[PDB]
């Protein structure tokens, strides 16, 4: 996946970022928003780096995490839960 | 778009790595620049080191009238001709024709007087030519050694056309500052000159060759040429706003200068040694060009710019910790 | 509150051309201008949008750096100190997005 | 307090030319020097957790290091007489750094005019 | 010693962020925030690892085997904790202990 | 204490050529290199400046520009650490105009 789009905002006192990669996939990480909030800063840093290089990467996500209907409608319910570098279009580092 | 953009990899992604905010000014030490057409927004400063006092080119010869404009257009033209780094501005230092005594030296000495405070203003000095008939060489060597010790600027110098083996040439027939041959380990590492030879038209991945011919043929020789860059069937701008096509080490030098300018934008605080080592280490090395170019180096703009902009990503783009 | 609330406004296909950072009443802030022109400001620990100060600062500085066209999400009338509003703006920066076209950008 | 208060001074169209970082009395600080040309130069320091401007240390450090890197012309906002330790004032400056802005010209910059 | 960091992975396990690096024979090592005795160095190591991944320069990877114990994590990645990093002069001569 | 105290030494016109990061007694540290100096997080008196100096030292390692290194000898006392690295604490950093003229106290 190439990360092609990046969105940042805030909801209910929590900053979040969204990414879209290309089929297309969207995933959002939210600061202090359990279970995956502990990873917000590491994933932000990594995703912004990969958006800059444009290198193919693996996006790990969890569907149905975000539940505010206007948010899910405009963006996604998917939580970003991990990122990996890739060697080929199918072979990437990690689980 | 021109053929050499794919050959050296001036892709959309590579160019997207460069920093828009950095004031980048290339020193075009030549026959004067006509800031017309695609160069109409490119002026930063203009100088004269010629007896007539004009910073604008003269019609002594068509070659000399067009030379400075041609070179500046390859570097930074914004429309018409495709400049390597269109965000760069140009500082024109007219040294020829009807130059003052040691016009080339006076222009480099004016650059080195550091009037402009920004690190990227005249950090890259393009010399698409130079001086033959150098007998003293004392003036050039004392200035070029000081520049290497100061470690902030780079001179991108054409090795000259005539297709001659620089190793077999007489000292008097060699072009300066390219002919600078540092002696000590200290002066060899500190060397601020990047000696550029011309390549014939090729496609990325294809084994390039030096541009030949009795007139526009690239000079060559291992330990006298640092890198080889495109220098054949090159479209450039003329003061009358029309375009011309040319070959030679002048074109090749202007293309290297543009690549370095693009790199400079990512961190102009980086030393001359840091940028020269990145450009040359990122260069493709061909076995067939070893006798002609030191380590058979060919300009890889994609590898040079991406390597340099990635190395500076965390210190410059992501300081926050 | 959410970046994508109807109340908040947008400006699509904008290149961040100006950047300012300062402090007001023990709170650091930063102001951006993009070009019609729009100005937006983010303040640290200044509710409702104070929690996104660091993320937005980093993102805004990055897009300033690249000069790419972006979408600026703002909320007018947030900053109320008259000399501040006069010199800078009243708009709070509440979000940022990458753009595909001058009108088509990623996000709400 | 505000960066745009009348008391605080400004220097427009400045290139940040020097950078220093150290520590004094358990507080990290950084100093910058900016020049408009030959004439003239301005120095300003930011100290972490050293009120009234202590809260902006991290933002100013990041922004000042960025502008030092680009060499772009900027406006430096400062407050004279903030630092008081005499050897520190002698070696460096009494000026606190209180803000930064990008410039369009040597005189026209983004942000408040004070 | 003299390893190029060629792969990078980031995730979370049991409320703790972590990152994994692979360098080239090959070596893998993971640093987890607030976990193990080496948890204190997570932020410094992440920053320094991502820096070296960006330059691609040869470095020295200091590791401790057997630190990570969750079997699916160990199977997918490594048991090695990342415990330090150094710049190298040659493929064997690097800065540090 | 101050970076500019007479007790602390300096080295001007230095290019940072080597970098090391690790941990000792639950505190992250980094070492730069000829002169060597280390900065340790939360290890007094200079522990407060760890993150600023890490950032600044990595920045100068990247540019390769000549800088001034401010240090305090005899701060680190663990003998195998001092043997492998240095007892010098890194206490400040400056940009330089020449090999001897740098910005800040001297």
């Amino acid at each position: 996946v190439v990360i092609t789009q990046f969105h940042t905002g805030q909801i209910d006192n929590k900053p979040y970022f969204c990414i879209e990669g290309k089929s297309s996939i969207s995933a959002c990480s939210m600061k202090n928003s359990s279970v995956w909030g502990a990873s917000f800063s590491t994933l932000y840093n990594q995703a912004l780096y990969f958006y800059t290089t444009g290198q193919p990467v693996r996006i790990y996500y969890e569907p149905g995490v975000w539940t505010y209907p206007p948010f899910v409608k405009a963006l996604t319910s998917n939580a970003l839960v991990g990122l990996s570098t890739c060697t080929t279009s199918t072979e990437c580092f990690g689980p | 778009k021109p053929w050499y953009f794919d050959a050296i990899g001036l892709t959309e992604t590579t160019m997207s790595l460069t920093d828009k905010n950095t004031p980048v000014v290339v020193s075009v030490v030549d026959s004067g620049v006509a800031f017309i057409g695609g160069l109409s927004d490119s002026e930063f400063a203009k100088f004269s080191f010629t007896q007539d006092g004009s910073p604008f080119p003269v019609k002594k010869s068509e070659a000399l009238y067009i030379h400075g404009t041609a070179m500046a257009s390859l570097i930074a033209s914004r429309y018409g001709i495709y400049g390597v780094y269109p965000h760069a501005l140009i500082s024109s230092r007219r040294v020829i024709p009807d130059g003052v005594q040691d016009s080339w030296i006076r222009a480099i000495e004016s650059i080195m007087s550091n009037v402009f405070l920004a690190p990227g203003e005249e950090k890259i000095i393009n010399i698409s030519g130079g001086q033959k008939g150098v007998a003293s060489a004392s003036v050039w060597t004392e200035l070029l050694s000081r520049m290497g010790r100061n470690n902030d600027r780079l001179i991108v110098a054409a090795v000259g056309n005539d297709g001659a083996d620089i190793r077999k040439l007489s000292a008097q027939q060699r072009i300066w500052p390219a002919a600078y041959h540092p002696v000590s380990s200290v002066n060899k590492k500190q060397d601020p000159v990047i000696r550029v030879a011309a390549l014939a038209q090729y496609r990325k991945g294809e084994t390039p060759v030096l541009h030949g011919g009795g007139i526009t043929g690239s000079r060559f020789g291992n330990n006298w040429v640092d890198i080889a860059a495109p220098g054949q069937n090159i479209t450039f701008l003329r003061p009358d706003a029309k375009t011309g096509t040319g070959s030679g080490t002048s074109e090749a030098t202007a293309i290297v200068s543009g690549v370095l300018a693009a790199m400079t934008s990512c961190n102009p605080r980086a030393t001359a040694t840091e940028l020269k080592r990145t450009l040359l280490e990122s260069a493709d090395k061909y076995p067939s060009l070893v006798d002609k170019v030191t380590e058979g180096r060919v300009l890889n703009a994609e590898k040079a710019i991406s390597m340099f902009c990635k190395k500076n990503y965390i210190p410059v783009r992501q300081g926050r910790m």
Side-chain angles (χ1 to χ4, degrees), chain A residues 3-8 16-20 43-52:
Chain A
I3 300 169
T4 48
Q5 304 292 326
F6 214 103
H7 166 70
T8 67
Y16 69 88
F17 71 100
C18 310
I19 52 157
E20 179 225 301
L43 290 175
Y44 173 80
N45 269 262
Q46 214 56 41
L48 190 58
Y49 179 73
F50 291 146
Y51 171 75
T52 305

mmCIF file of all heavy atoms in Angstrom, chain A residues 3-8 16-20 43-52:
data_model
loop_
_atom_site.group_PDB
_atom_site.id
_atom_site.type_symbol
_atom_site.label_atom_id
_atom_site.label_comp_id
_atom_site.label_asym_id
_atom_site.label_seq_id
_atom_site.Cartn_x
_atom_site.Cartn_y
_atom_site.Cartn_z
ATOM 1 N N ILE A 3 0.665 5.136 0.994
ATOM 2 C CA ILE A 3 -0.129 6.110 1.760
ATOM 3 C C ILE A 3 -0.211 7.355 0.901
ATOM 4 O O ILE A 3 0.817 7.952 0.606
ATOM 5 C CB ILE A 3 0.440 6.408 3.176
ATOM 6 C CG1 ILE A 3 0.497 5.139 4.039
ATOM 7 C CG2 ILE A 3 -0.370 7.536 3.855
ATOM 8 C CD1 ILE A 3 1.249 5.268 5.317
ATOM 9 N N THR A 4 -1.420 7.724 0.485
ATOM 10 C CA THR A 4 -1.660 8.788 -0.488
ATOM 11 C C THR A 4 -2.360 9.975 0.087
ATOM 12 O O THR A 4 -2.310 11.064 -0.511
ATOM 13 C CB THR A 4 -2.529 8.253 -1.664
ATOM 14 O OG1 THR A 4 -3.656 7.536 -1.163
ATOM 15 C CG2 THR A 4 -1.755 7.356 -2.600
ATOM 16 N N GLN A 5 -3.072 9.768 1.196
ATOM 17 C CA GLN A 5 -3.809 10.856 1.818
ATOM 18 C C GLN A 5 -3.556 10.862 3.326
ATOM 19 O O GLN A 5 -3.307 9.817 3.927
ATOM 20 C CB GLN A 5 -5.320 10.772 1.500
ATOM 21 C CG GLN A 5 -5.695 10.731 0.001
ATOM 22 C CD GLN A 5 -5.428 11.992 -0.781
ATOM 23 O OE1 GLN A 5 -5.543 13.124 -0.297
ATOM 24 N NE2 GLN A 5 -5.204 11.827 -2.060
ATOM 25 N N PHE A 6 -3.623 12.037 3.923
ATOM 26 C CA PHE A 6 -3.390 12.223 5.333
ATOM 27 C C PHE A 6 -4.371 13.253 5.854
ATOM 28 O O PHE A 6 -4.559 14.298 5.232
ATOM 29 C CB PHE A 6 -1.933 12.679 5.570
ATOM 30 C CG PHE A 6 -1.284 12.189 6.848
ATOM 31 C CD1 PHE A 6 -0.371 11.139 6.825
ATOM 32 C CD2 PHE A 6 -1.567 12.794 8.071
ATOM 33 C CE1 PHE A 6 0.243 10.692 8.001
ATOM 34 C CE2 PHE A 6 -0.972 12.333 9.250
ATOM 35 C CZ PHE A 6 -0.065 11.288 9.206
ATOM 36 N N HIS A 7 -5.040 12.941 6.968
ATOM 37 C CA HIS A 7 -5.972 13.866 7.624
ATOM 38 C C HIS A 7 -5.694 13.889 9.112
ATOM 39 O O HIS A 7 -5.393 12.857 9.688
ATOM 40 C CB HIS A 7 -7.451 13.506 7.348
ATOM 41 C CG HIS A 7 -8.432 14.202 8.234
ATOM 42 N ND1 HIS A 7 -8.672 15.561 8.136
ATOM 43 C CD2 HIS A 7 -9.241 13.685 9.178
ATOM 44 C CE1 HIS A 7 -9.595 15.826 9.047
ATOM 45 N NE2 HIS A 7 -9.963 14.731 9.701
ATOM 46 N N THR A 8 -5.750 15.061 9.714
ATOM 47 C CA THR A 8 -5.588 15.215 11.151
ATOM 48 C C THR A 8 -6.717 16.103 11.662
ATOM 49 O O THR A 8 -7.083 17.094 11.022
ATOM 50 C CB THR A 8 -4.189 15.772 11.533
ATOM 51 O OG1 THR A 8 -4.025 17.114 11.081
ATOM 52 C CG2 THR A 8 -3.009 14.852 11.147
ATOM 53 N N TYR A 16 -6.545 13.032 16.507
ATOM 54 C CA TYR A 16 -6.498 11.780 15.746
ATOM 55 C C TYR A 16 -5.894 12.070 14.381
ATOM 56 O O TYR A 16 -5.903 13.223 13.946
ATOM 57 C CB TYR A 16 -7.926 11.144 15.593
ATOM 58 C CG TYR A 16 -8.849 11.947 14.698
ATOM 59 C CD1 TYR A 16 -8.879 11.734 13.322
ATOM 60 C CD2 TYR A 16 -9.648 12.963 15.219
ATOM 61 C CE1 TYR A 16 -9.662 12.527 12.483
ATOM 62 C CE2 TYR A 16 -10.467 13.735 14.394
ATOM 63 C CZ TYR A 16 -10.454 13.530 13.024
ATOM 64 O OH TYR A 16 -11.232 14.325 12.220
ATOM 65 N N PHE A 17 -5.426 11.046 13.673
ATOM 66 C CA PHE A 17 -5.045 11.237 12.286
ATOM 67 C C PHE A 17 -5.649 10.104 11.498
ATOM 68 O O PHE A 17 -5.861 9.025 12.043
ATOM 69 C CB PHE A 17 -3.523 11.355 12.020
ATOM 70 C CG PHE A 17 -2.759 10.065 12.198
ATOM 71 C CD1 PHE A 17 -2.404 9.287 11.104
ATOM 72 C CD2 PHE A 17 -2.406 9.622 13.462
ATOM 73 C CE1 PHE A 17 -1.703 8.095 11.287
ATOM 74 C CE2 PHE A 17 -1.702 8.443 13.639
ATOM 75 C CZ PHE A 17 -1.360 7.682 12.558
ATOM 76 N N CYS A 18 -5.903 10.363 10.212
ATOM 77 C CA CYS A 18 -6.432 9.423 9.236
ATOM 78 C C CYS A 18 -5.450 9.302 8.111
ATOM 79 O O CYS A 18 -4.788 10.285 7.752
ATOM 80 C CB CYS A 18 -7.791 9.877 8.711
ATOM 81 S SG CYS A 18 -8.978 10.326 9.995
ATOM 82 N N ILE A 19 -5.378 8.107 7.532
ATOM 83 C CA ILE A 19 -4.581 7.851 6.342
ATOM 84 C C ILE A 19 -5.422 7.051 5.378
ATOM 85 O O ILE A 19 -6.283 6.250 5.785
ATOM 86 C CB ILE A 19 -3.238 7.128 6.594
ATOM 87 C CG1 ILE A 19 -3.424 5.849 7.419
ATOM 88 C CG2 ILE A 19 -2.207 8.061 7.175
ATOM 89 C CD1 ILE A 19 -2.365 4.842 7.262
ATOM 90 N N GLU A 20 -5.126 7.225 4.106
ATOM 91 C CA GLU A 20 -5.721 6.434 3.066
ATOM 92 C C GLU A 20 -4.595 5.917 2.223
ATOM 93 O O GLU A 20 -3.703 6.681 1.816
ATOM 94 C CB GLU A 20 -6.723 7.240 2.230
ATOM 95 C CG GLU A 20 -7.351 6.426 1.101
ATOM 96 C CD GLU A 20 -7.393 7.183 -0.208
ATOM 97 O OE1 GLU A 20 -8.010 8.272 -0.225
ATOM 98 O OE2 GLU A 20 -6.706 6.770 -1.171
ATOM 99 N N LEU A 43 2.803 5.504 15.581
ATOM 100 C CA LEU A 43 2.121 5.348 14.302
ATOM 101 C C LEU A 43 2.038 6.674 13.512
ATOM 102 O O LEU A 43 2.162 6.653 12.290
ATOM 103 C CB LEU A 43 0.714 4.767 14.515
ATOM 104 C CG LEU A 43 0.607 3.304 14.966
ATOM 105 C CD1 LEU A 43 -0.844 2.946 15.251
ATOM 106 C CD2 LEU A 43 1.183 2.369 13.944
ATOM 107 N N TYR A 44 1.818 7.813 14.195
ATOM 108 C CA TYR A 44 1.766 9.114 13.524
ATOM 109 C C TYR A 44 3.076 9.369 12.815
ATOM 110 O O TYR A 44 3.097 9.705 11.624
ATOM 111 C CB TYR A 44 1.457 10.255 14.494
ATOM 112 C CG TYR A 44 1.575 11.609 13.842
ATOM 113 C CD1 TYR A 44 0.550 12.115 13.049
ATOM 114 C CD2 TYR A 44 2.729 12.379 13.988
ATOM 115 C CE1 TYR A 44 0.650 13.372 12.454
ATOM 116 C CE2 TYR A 44 2.844 13.633 13.390
ATOM 117 C CZ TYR A 44 1.791 14.137 12.644
ATOM 118 O OH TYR A 44 1.890 15.382 12.076
ATOM 119 N N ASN A 45 4.168 9.209 13.568
ATOM 120 C CA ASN A 45 5.533 9.434 13.116
ATOM 121 C C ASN A 45 5.858 8.578 11.895
ATOM 122 O O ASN A 45 6.326 9.097 10.872
ATOM 123 C CB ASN A 45 6.491 9.128 14.270
ATOM 124 C CG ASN A 45 6.839 10.298 15.163
ATOM 125 O OD1 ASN A 45 7.894 10.918 14.990
ATOM 126 N ND2 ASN A 45 6.038 10.572 16.177
ATOM 127 N N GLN A 46 5.592 7.276 12.003
ATOM 128 C CA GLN A 46 5.835 6.252 10.978
ATOM 129 C C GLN A 46 5.007 6.528 9.704
ATOM 130 O O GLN A 46 5.576 6.607 8.616
ATOM 131 C CB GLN A 46 5.520 4.863 11.579
ATOM 132 C CG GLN A 46 6.384 3.715 11.075
ATOM 133 C CD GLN A 46 7.859 3.960 11.258
ATOM 134 O OE1 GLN A 46 8.297 4.479 12.299
ATOM 135 N NE2 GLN A 46 8.660 3.595 10.273
ATOM 136 N N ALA A 47 3.682 6.728 9.856
ATOM 137 C CA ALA A 47 2.759 7.031 8.756
ATOM 138 C C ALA A 47 3.156 8.314 8.005
ATOM 139 O O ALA A 47 3.163 8.314 6.778
ATOM 140 C CB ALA A 47 1.344 7.155 9.278
ATOM 141 N N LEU A 48 3.520 9.380 8.725
ATOM 142 C CA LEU A 48 3.962 10.618 8.083
ATOM 143 C C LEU A 48 5.266 10.409 7.309
ATOM 144 O O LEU A 48 5.427 10.940 6.198
ATOM 145 C CB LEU A 48 4.106 11.757 9.081
ATOM 146 C CG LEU A 48 4.325 13.145 8.451
ATOM 147 C CD1 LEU A 48 3.181 13.553 7.497
ATOM 148 C CD2 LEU A 48 4.522 14.203 9.509
ATOM 149 N N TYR A 49 6.173 9.603 7.877
ATOM 150 C CA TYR A 49 7.430 9.269 7.202
ATOM 151 C C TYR A 49 7.130 8.519 5.885
ATOM 152 O O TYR A 49 7.676 8.880 4.823
ATOM 153 C CB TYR A 49 8.364 8.421 8.105
ATOM 154 C CG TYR A 49 9.656 8.065 7.397
ATOM 155 C CD1 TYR A 49 10.649 9.028 7.182
ATOM 156 C CD2 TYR A 49 9.827 6.821 6.799
ATOM 157 C CE1 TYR A 49 11.778 8.754 6.405
ATOM 158 C CE2 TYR A 49 11.008 6.504 6.113
ATOM 159 C CZ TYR A 49 11.988 7.477 5.928
ATOM 160 O OH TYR A 49 13.135 7.270 5.195
ATOM 161 N N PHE A 50 6.279 7.460 5.962
ATOM 162 C CA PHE A 50 5.924 6.661 4.798
ATOM 163 C C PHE A 50 5.103 7.454 3.805
ATOM 164 O O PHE A 50 5.290 7.274 2.620
ATOM 165 C CB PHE A 50 5.199 5.409 5.219
ATOM 166 C CG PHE A 50 6.035 4.387 5.958
ATOM 167 C CD1 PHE A 50 5.467 3.598 6.958
ATOM 168 C CD2 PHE A 50 7.365 4.166 5.609
ATOM 169 C CE1 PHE A 50 6.214 2.624 7.611
ATOM 170 C CE2 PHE A 50 8.121 3.203 6.275
ATOM 171 C CZ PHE A 50 7.538 2.427 7.262
ATOM 172 N N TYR A 51 4.258 8.381 4.260
ATOM 173 C CA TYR A 51 3.557 9.268 3.330
ATOM 174 C C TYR A 51 4.581 10.108 2.521
ATOM 175 O O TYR A 51 4.407 10.302 1.319
ATOM 176 C CB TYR A 51 2.590 10.190 4.073
ATOM 177 C CG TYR A 51 2.004 11.273 3.194
ATOM 178 C CD1 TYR A 51 1.013 10.982 2.254
ATOM 179 C CD2 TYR A 51 2.439 12.586 3.301
ATOM 180 C CE1 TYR A 51 0.488 11.970 1.432
ATOM 181 C CE2 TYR A 51 1.921 13.583 2.485
ATOM 182 C CZ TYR A 51 0.953 13.270 1.546
ATOM 183 O OH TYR A 51 0.463 14.266 0.745
ATOM 184 N N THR A 52 5.650 10.591 3.195
ATOM 185 C CA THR A 52 6.701 11.406 2.583
ATOM 186 C C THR A 52 7.471 10.592 1.539
ATOM 187 O O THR A 52 7.635 11.070 0.423
ATOM 188 C CB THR A 52 7.630 11.970 3.667
ATOM 189 O OG1 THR A 52 6.852 12.686 4.621
ATOM 190 C CG2 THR A 52 8.721 12.886 3.111
#
